[PDB]
């Protein structure tokens, strides 16, 4: 594990490291101060050289210059702006409906299956939950992955994540079926445009969205690649760390009952067996919070981010050459014993009211400028989806399923988190 590598470099070789990755020499920073500097000023930017990569893929176009992939500052603050509208404190609300019907499904069909004895991806299902929650969310359509509709869909984002994967770590088969993964993606967004526009056409009244902000940002624009750049940024961007996220924290938990126990008392307290959360009910979810804040420190999907360094300069006492990729790692630092006490013990408790928050030791949605534009949506649904499975689902992992992870192009389990389940 690529990660696991600069961890141990790390650790050794001190906070600052050169390396290869995806085929570019990257220097590692690893202290707090570090990224602290270079992530909480405006002055830093992504690195377009190791961006290019998810910009086009096997020659074919996939995120171009949509809001993750775009390192250009003033190219990314205009459309940043404008598609903000759509994560206000009020949109976000506005979406506890989607999150508690898709959550309250996944449940369902679950227990449809909670005999003990019939084995579930959770990392599936998780990954349905996510898209439909996505999809409906963001863009007003409805997937039904959940309902087992969609098939060929999710086979095309399969593949398209196999294909980074393969095209930034060093078959024809594979391109092939890469490349029509990837247009198929875009197609899809293609339609969910003139669905939308369709609508508007006519003149119905769409409420606010995602969708809205995107096609807003692309007013003005002599064709809509931009706007599908964004489009499939959102779809994949949207869904797949949510599910990573969801699929690390029940791995987890299969083997944390003290912790769990705490979880369903926990539920039992501030919600009890009521079916539908209410916003205010998120934020009494304390102890979940602290579990899911504990998950991603060891299992961040997303591992880390690139600033360019444009100038000689001296990080740590070593000079760094100018033209350089830094590289930053939420991975490396959660797994550091010299800022995190017994680096690798699942403990929640570090997340308790009155512990110190960590000091730029931890940043799973990154940080500054350039932070996840969807963290708090993030939260929103990861809480909901957690909270119902709590509330009426046990689970036991499958014998000889593995709890370690994959570098795909997130982190993601090795093993695709199958159980065995049954009502509480
Ligand atoms: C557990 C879930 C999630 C995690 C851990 C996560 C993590 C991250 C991180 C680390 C970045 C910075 C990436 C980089 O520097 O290359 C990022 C960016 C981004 N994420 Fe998330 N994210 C998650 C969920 C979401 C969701 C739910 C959405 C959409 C609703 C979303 C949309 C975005 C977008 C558009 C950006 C680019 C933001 C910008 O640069 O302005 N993510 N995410
Ligand atoms: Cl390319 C990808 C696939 C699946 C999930 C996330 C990403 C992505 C990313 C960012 C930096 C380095 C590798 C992957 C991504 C990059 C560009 C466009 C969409 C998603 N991402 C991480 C967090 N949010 C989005």
Redesign the pocket.
């Known amino acids: 594990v690529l990660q696991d590598v600069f961890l141990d470099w790390a650790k050794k070789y001190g906070p600052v490291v050169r390396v290869n990755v995806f085929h570019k020499t990257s220097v590692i920073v690893t202290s707090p101060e570090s990224v602290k500097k270079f992530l909480m000023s405006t002055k830093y930017n992504?690195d377009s050289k190791m961006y290019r990569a998810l910009q086009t893929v096997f020659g074919e176009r996939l995120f171009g210059q949509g809001?993750?992939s775009e390192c250009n500052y003033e190219r990314?603050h205009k459309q940043?702006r404008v598609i903000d509208l759509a994560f206000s404190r009020s949109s976000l609300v506005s979406l506890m409906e989607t999150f508690n019907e898709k959550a309250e499904q996944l449940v369902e069909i679950l227990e449809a299956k909670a005999d003990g004895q019939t084995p579930v991806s959770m990392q599936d299902m998780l990954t349905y939950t996510a898209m439909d929650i996505?999809a409906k969310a963001?863009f007003g359509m409805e997937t039904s992955m959940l309902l087992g509709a969609q098939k060929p869909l999710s086979q095309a984002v399969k593949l398209m994540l196999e294909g980074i994967t393969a095209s930034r770590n060093t078959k024809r088969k594979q391109l092939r079926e890469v490349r029509e993964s990837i247009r198929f993606l875009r197609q899809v967004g293609r339609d969910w445009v003139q669905r939308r526009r369709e609508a508007l056409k006519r003149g119905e009244e769409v409420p606010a969205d995602?969708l809205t902000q995107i096609l807003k940002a692309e007013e003005g624009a002599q064709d809509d690649e931009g706007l599908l750049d964004n489009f499939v940024?959102?779809f994949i961007?949207?869904?797949e760390?949510?599910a990573?996220?969801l699929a690390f924290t029940v791995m987890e938990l299969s083997r944390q009952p003290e912790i769990v126990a705490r979880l369903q008392a926990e539920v039992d307290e501030v919600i009890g067996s009521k079916r539908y959360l209410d916003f205010e009910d998120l934020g009494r979810l304390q102890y979940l919070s602290q579990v899911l804040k504990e998950s991603?420190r060891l299992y961040?999907?997303?591992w880390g981010?690139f600033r360019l360094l444009e100038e000689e300069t001296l990080i740590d006492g070593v000079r760094v050459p100018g033209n350089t990729p830094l590289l930053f790692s939420t991975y490396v630092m959660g797994r550091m014993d010299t800022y995190f006490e017994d680096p690798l013990t699942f403990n929640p408790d570090r997340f308790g009211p009155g512990a110190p928050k960590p000091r730029f030791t931890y940043?799973?949605?990154?940080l500054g400028?350039?932070?996840?534009?969807?963290?708090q949506?993030?939260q929103m649904?990861?809480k909901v989806v957690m909270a119902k499975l709590l509330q009426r689902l046990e689970f036991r992992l499958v014998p000889g399923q593995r709890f370690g992870l994959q570098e795909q192009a997130t982190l993601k389990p090795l093993d695709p988190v199958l159980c065995t389940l049954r009502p509480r």
């Open positions: 992504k809001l993750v990314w940043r996505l963001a995602i940024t959102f961007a949207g869904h760390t949510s990573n996220h991603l961040p999907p997303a981010t940043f799973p949605f990154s400028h350039r932070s996840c534009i969807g963290q949506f993030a649904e990861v």
